[PDB]
């Protein structure tokens, strides 16, 4: 039965009750369900008015906070040296919930989601080794949808951006903000795909088109300055509007890809492939218990 | 135009505040919603559905065999079978649980918990056990005439396979505290031991070892504040690929 | 009241004599897709009885050593009966499952099961960077075994497996286990062949032992689509 | 420093039982895979499939998994190769090889071997 | 099974020229590797994660290409590196390889 539950539940006082036919500690885990045994039912207890609210562990306010989806540093100056593996004053990103732990452990706690992104971009530019000073730059980032044409140069006329959206700032300027919708062609994302995208049987296996918000193009507007600088773009994203579905395990090993779940686990334990929780001596050891 | 001026915290970025921002996409409609099973609104419906504590973690113990505490007939009377520290946000038993992982979001809890303990011995298996909690304050009793003295609940083996041993909030203060120290006053919620009340008698033919799966949930009693990050996850490099995401 | 349980849909019926209060996932029961929530145009076809029975799988052999196995669904059943075929003509489907999973023992036998449905199961490798591949992750009918069943082979906890739709078998309190699963998806029908969105799991959390004389113990799994649908009529691409 | 010792070439016969081993030298045994490829005169390389001495734990190409089975040893740090019903299409050089120490892709290879199919 | 397209299958070049090969996939893999096979000798790595470069490789090596379509540049060519060339594929299993490139100098 669904209802509205604002605060904890309120504490009954209880007697002495001795009956038969009537067993309220006992149980059938087998069925799947949860123990339903109260506390009045188990021991004696005392009426208690519980005032605690439960409106900090609601899936709204626990999955919505600003962690960061993704940091990329490169080098501003002139590039007609440098090779090509190195970025040329813009640099691609598909957008993606998998690069930092925080945030990924806590949105696969369930199988899917229907939420709306809020993005924010923040930059801290640096010197090259002698001291000069911090320039006020005007970086460009353009959101560009996933398989389309995305620019090749700093140069390039793909910046023009007459149709995908762009937002322009200042480093001196407040982060620039903006709210990415709910895009997925279906009515949720799916945070764990099993199958294939393709019909051919050479498709990657988890990675699933339409969970992916797009490609995040970012440049620096100005031209190369006599000096090489250093600038390091950090994205933040906040969920909001959230819905979700199908909890699932918190995820007990470390990461190690981002394009599939595989584990690998520490050389012991905690969090070790064989024992997650770190090991005592025996059964009847307690580790912290007081001795006087 | 309105007169105004800027208050102190202007211009700053808040990864908690709550704020209207600009649309990316002019006029777009978002797919229709599809009702799909298993909503959850709020993440108190997850920490109460039971999940297996860990009671075996040990040496000479690997995989799956750190999940079930077997138990074996005895000589002796008045013998202890196993212990639990109750501490939900240590590295305990209850950490790899359902209510223990959510829990380790937040700083401060409150509510009572249950125990349930299903005995997957054969169904010629007969016995008594005592499933004891003590609050704070003491040493672990060592022995089941000590252990007696608090909370508790006498078992025995049946149709039904399944105790629930409730663990009632009992402390001075609304809320306990996950601060490392674990011998504080704040925080030490008190032990829980596990006496044969009689023995564990089987025939010849049964096997001798029966196991016991401990289960953790939480009542509807329960609460969490102040969200933190969680211990739980870490990273010291950058994962595999996330290079290739800017390429 | 809640022991003995039969289920008769189509022309297959099962009976069980220990069997605890068969559980429905999420409180959801199967249903056929409504008028509202409709994407595609062409009429579907709705074959009831035909594809609607229980399909009796391969046995397992329950043994100390086992580490547990799983199946995919629908992918178990693209090959079977009717609703194989429906599946190899049609480009679309959307049906519910019932799950029925039958172990039993003599009363001198310990042991228990957790038979669990993991709602959309990404499957990882362990000590590899290495995507899993096609042939890993698509066994057919036989089903594949967990290489490491404590971690559930996607890294996750199996402490926590309970939060899925779940039953125990218990082999002194019951010899079967019963899950209904609805239609689960973010989409409201899919492609039959590439996406499979139940993984059936049935996992030694306590190993089997006795002192008797030893014997095999089949583990049994018959699986029954409900409410089927399939759109997209075109040749067997099977 | 680490050097994978193979030996040369073997000849065989039509339909027994092929031996072929693999050594290692220079890091630990139990820390890395064992990766097994096959060349056939003038054609492209073929990879055969992985096992993990900790746990004797392996991984094999889907093609050659039926006619092939792998042997680890962490006492001699001799890892085995061992194939079935030697044919004509069986005749190839026989590498062992393993990730590099932080990068992917086989960085230390083998001598290889020279398999010889007469009937 | 990703299939893994080496073309061209074969180019003469000159010592000092720059050769180009390309890679092409049946499907989107991730990173490409690349490798040389001397003419009777056992394969080495060159450039692992389409980027950098193995040990005793020269700068002249180098490696691009992202999606479905990976390629190896070489800046100056000479005529010791005359040899096979494959890429293979870490995102799925089995390990797939490419069909080879033979050249010589001219």
């Known amino acids: 039965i669904e209802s509205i539950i604002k605060t904890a539940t309120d504490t009954v006082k209880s007697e002495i009750n001795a009956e038969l036919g009537v067993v309220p500690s006992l149980n059938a885990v087998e069925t799947g369900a949860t123990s339903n045994t109260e506390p009045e039912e188990a021991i004696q207890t005392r009426t208690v008015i519980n005032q605690h609210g439960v409106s900090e562990t609601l899936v709204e306010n626990f999955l919505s906070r600003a962690a960061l989806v993704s940091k990329r540093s490169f080098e501003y100056k002139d590039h007609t040296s440098s090779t090509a593996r190195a970025d040329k004053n813009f640099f691609k990103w598909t957008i993606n919930t998998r690069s930092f732990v925080q945030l990924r452990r806590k949105l696969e706690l369930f199988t899917y989601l229907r939420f709306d992104a809020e993005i924010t971009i923040l930059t801290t530019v640096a010197v090259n080794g002698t001291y000069v000073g911090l320039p006020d730059l005007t970086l460009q980032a353009m959101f560009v949808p996933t398989g389309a044409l995305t620019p090749e140069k700093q140069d390039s006329f793909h910046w023009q951006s007459g149709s995908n959206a762009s937002v322009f700032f200042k480093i001196s300027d407040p982060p620039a903000r903006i709210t990415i919708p709910f895009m997925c062609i279906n009515s949720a994302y799916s945070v764990f795909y099993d199958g294939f995208a393709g019909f051919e049987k050479n498709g990657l296996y988890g990675i699933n088109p339409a969970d992916t918000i797009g490609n995040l193009c970012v440049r620096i507007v100005n031209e190369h300055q006599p000096v090489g600088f250093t600038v390091t773009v950090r994205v933040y994203m906040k969920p909001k509007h959230i819905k979700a579905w199908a909890p699932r395990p918190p995820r007990t090993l470390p990461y190690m890809s981002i394009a599939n779940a595989n584990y690998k686990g520490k050389e012991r334990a905690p969090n070790a492939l064989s024992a997650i929780i770190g090991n005592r001596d025996s059964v009847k050891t307690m580790p912290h218990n007081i001795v006087n | 135009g309105v007169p105004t001026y800027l208050l102190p915290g202007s211009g700053q970025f808040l990864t908690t505040d709550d704020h209207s921002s600009a649309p990316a996409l002019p006029c777009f409609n978002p797919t229709p919603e599809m009702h799909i099973p298993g909503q959850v609104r709020n993440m108190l419906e997850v920490v109460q559905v039971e999940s297996m504590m860990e009671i075996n973690n040990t040496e000479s113990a690997v995989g799956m065999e750190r999940l079930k505490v077997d138990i074996s007939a005895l000589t002796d009377v008045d013998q202890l079978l196993f212990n639990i520290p109750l501490d939900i946000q240590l590295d305990g038993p209850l950490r790899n649980t359902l209510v223990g992982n959510i829990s380790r979001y937040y700083t401060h809890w409150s509510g009572s918990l249950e125990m349930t303990f299903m005995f997957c011995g054969s169904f010629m298996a007969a016995g008594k056990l005592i499933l004891c909690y003590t609050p704070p304050g003491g040493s672990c009793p060592t022995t089941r005439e000590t252990a007696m003295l608090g909370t508790h609940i006498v078992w025995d083996f049946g149709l039904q396979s399944s105790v629930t041993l409730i663990i009632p909030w009992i402390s001075g203060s609304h809320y306990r505290m996950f601060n490392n120290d674990a011998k504080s006053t704040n925080a030490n919620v008190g032990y829980v031991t596990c006496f044969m009340q009689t023995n564990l008698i089987v025939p010849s033919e049964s096997s001798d070892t029966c196991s016991l799966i401990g289960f953790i949930a939480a009542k509807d009693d329960f609460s969490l504040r102040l969200m933190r990050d969680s211990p739980d996850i870490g990273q010291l490099d950058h994962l595999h690929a996330a290079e290739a995401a800017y390429q | 009241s809640d022991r003995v349980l039969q289920l008769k849909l189509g022309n297959s019926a099962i009976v069980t004599q220990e069997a605890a209060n068969y559980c429905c996932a999420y409180g959801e029961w199967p249903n056929y897709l409504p008028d509202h929530e409709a994407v595609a145009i062409d009429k579907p076809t709705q074959p009831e009885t035909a594809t609607d029975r229980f399909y009796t799988l391969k046995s397992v052999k329950w043994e100390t050593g086992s580490t547990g196995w799983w199946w995919k669904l629908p992918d178990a059943l693209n090959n079977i009966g009717m609703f194989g075929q429906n599946v190899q003509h049609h480009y679309l489907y959307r049906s519910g499952f019932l799950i029925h999973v039958q172990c039993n023992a003599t009363k001198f036998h310990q042991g228990a099961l957790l038979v669990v449905a993991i709602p959309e199961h990404q499957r990882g490798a362990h000590n590899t960077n290495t995507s899993p591949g096609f042939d890993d992750i698509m066994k057919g009918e036989e089903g594949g075994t967990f290489n490491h069943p404590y971690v559930l082979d996607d890294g996750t906890s199996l402490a926590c497996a309970t939060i899925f739709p779940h039953q125990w078998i218990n082999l002194r309190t019951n010899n079967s286990a019963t899950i209904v699963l609805p239609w689960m998806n973010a989409a409201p029908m899919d492609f039959p062949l590439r996406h499979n969105q139940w993984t059936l799991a049935i996992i030694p959390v306590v190993p089997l032992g006795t002192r008797t004389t030893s014997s095999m113990v089949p583990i049994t799994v018959s699986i029954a689509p409900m409410c089927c649908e399939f759109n997209g009529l075109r040749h067997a691409i099977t | 420093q680490v050097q994978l010792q193979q030996p040369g070439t073997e000849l065989v016969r039509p339909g027994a039982s092929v031996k072929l081993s693999c050594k290692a030298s220079?890091?630990?045994?139990?820390?890395?895979?064992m990766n097994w490829v096959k060349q056939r005169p003038g054609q492209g390389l073929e990879w055969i499939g992985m096992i993990h001495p900790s746990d004797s734990e392996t991984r094999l190409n889907q093609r050659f998994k039926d006619k092939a089975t792998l042997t680890v040893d962490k006492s001699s740090n001799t890892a085995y190769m061992q194939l079935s019903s030697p044919t004509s299409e069986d005749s190839a050089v026989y590498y062992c090889?393993?990730?590099?120490?932080?990068?992917?892709?086989?960085?230390?290879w083998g001598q290889g071997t020279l398999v010889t199919v007469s009937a | 099974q990703i299939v893994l397209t080496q073309s061209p299958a074969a180019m003469s070049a000159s010592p000092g020229e720059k050769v180009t090969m390309t890679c092409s996939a049946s499907?989107?893999?991730?990173?490409m590797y690349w490798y040389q096979q001397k003419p009777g000798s056992s394969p080495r790595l060159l450039i692992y994660?389409?980027?950098n470069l193995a040990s005793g490789v020269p700068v002249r090596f180098s490696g691009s290409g992202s999606g479905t379509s990976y390629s190896l540049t070489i800046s100056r060519m000479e005529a010791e590196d005359a040899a096979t060339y494959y890429c293979?594929?870490?995102?799925?299993?089995?390990?797939?390889f490419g069909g080879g490139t033979k050249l010589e100098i001219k």
């Open positions: 499907s989107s893999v991730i990173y």
């Open positions: 220079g890091y630990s045994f139990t820390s890395y895979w």
């Open positions: 090889a393993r990730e590099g120490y932080d990068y992917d892709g086989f960085a230390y």
């Open positions: 293979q594929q870490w995102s799925s299993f089995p390990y797939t």
């Open positions: 994660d389409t980027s």
